[PDB]
């Protein structure tokens, strides 16, 4: 019934608060100055970048791209911790869990990245940096076209004014996608996603009673996500070829290969 679906939205929301340190809540506080706490160090150019190293953790584009690698890796670890709390996920065939995560974590990275973005830039190092969108375009090809698709998604996506408790179910719906290439056993995956989709719809009716067909609007964006992902994998294919001083992190390499 409706009761069991609110319980599921609650379990998911709690796991999400526990698994993800910088939530959309904090991120909007920071981005609005409404935190009334220490503003982030703004990185708008080459000099601001190198002055910034104190609040952050050989070529600039190559250094930016490879620093995002450590962030991606800690994201994959947070998202993997999170998936394990999705009821019935860990009881799946371990080979299915790996496949769902492999195809899922980048779609969730771009989903949650949008929480940290406005039209002008994106929070970095857990909200204590803010790197400008223009500075990121300012990078040298093929690095100047890396974050611009994500800024483009984030501005349309942030329109739906979702909050952490909507995103917690939405994330879980993305992971439990029964149509991932290579799934040994689709049905029990689709059983869980059916429940999650029902929980998401309830949550969206309750938390946004004025907002209408937010549920429908949000399922079409799960498509926008897959293309920002395939576009992303190609741009890596290119720079893995054109730039071979660069090291791809082992974990990132496990994911993107056979994708």
């Amino acid at each position: 019934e409706s009761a069991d679906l609110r319980a599921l939205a609650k379990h998911l929301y709690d796991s999400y608060i526990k698994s993800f340190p910088l939530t959309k809540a904090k991120a909007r506080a920071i981005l609005t100055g409404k935190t009334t706490d220490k503003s982030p160090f703004v990185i708008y150019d080459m000099n601001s970048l190198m002055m910034g190293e104190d609040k952050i953790k050989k070529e600039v584009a190559i250094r930016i791209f490879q620093g995002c690698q450590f962030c991606s890796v800690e994201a994959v670890q947070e998202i993997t911790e999170y998936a394990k709390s999705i009821p019935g996920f860990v009881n799946l065939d371990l080979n299915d869990q790996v496949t769902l995560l492999k195809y899922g974590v980048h779609e969730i990275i771009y989903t949650m990245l949008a929480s940290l973005m406005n039209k002008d830039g994106v929070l970095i190092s857990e909200g204590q940096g803010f790197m400008t969108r223009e500075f990121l375009k300012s990078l040298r090809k093929p690095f100047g076209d890396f974050m611009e698709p994500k800024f483009e998604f984030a501005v349309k996506f942030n329109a739906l004014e979702l909050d952490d408790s909507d995103l917690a179910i939405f994330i879980a719906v993305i992971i439990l996608s029964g149509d991932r290439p290579g799934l040994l056993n689709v049905k029990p995956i689709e059983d869980i996603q059916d429940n999650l989709l029902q929980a998401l719809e309830l949550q969206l009716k309750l938390n946004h009673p004025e907002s209408s067909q937010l549920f429908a609007k949000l399922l079409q964006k799960m498509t926008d996500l897959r293309q920002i992902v395939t576009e992303h994998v190609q741009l890596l294919q290119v720079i893995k070829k054109t730039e071979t001083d660069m090291s791809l992190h082992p974990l990132l390499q496990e994911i993107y290969k056979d994708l």
Binding site: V76, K84, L94, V98, K102
Partner: peptide, 11 residues
């Protein structure tokens, strides 16, 4: 095959 993922999962 996916030894870091297998390991993050089964951790």
């Amino acid at each position: 095959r996916h030894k870091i993922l297998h390991r993050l999962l089964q951790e």
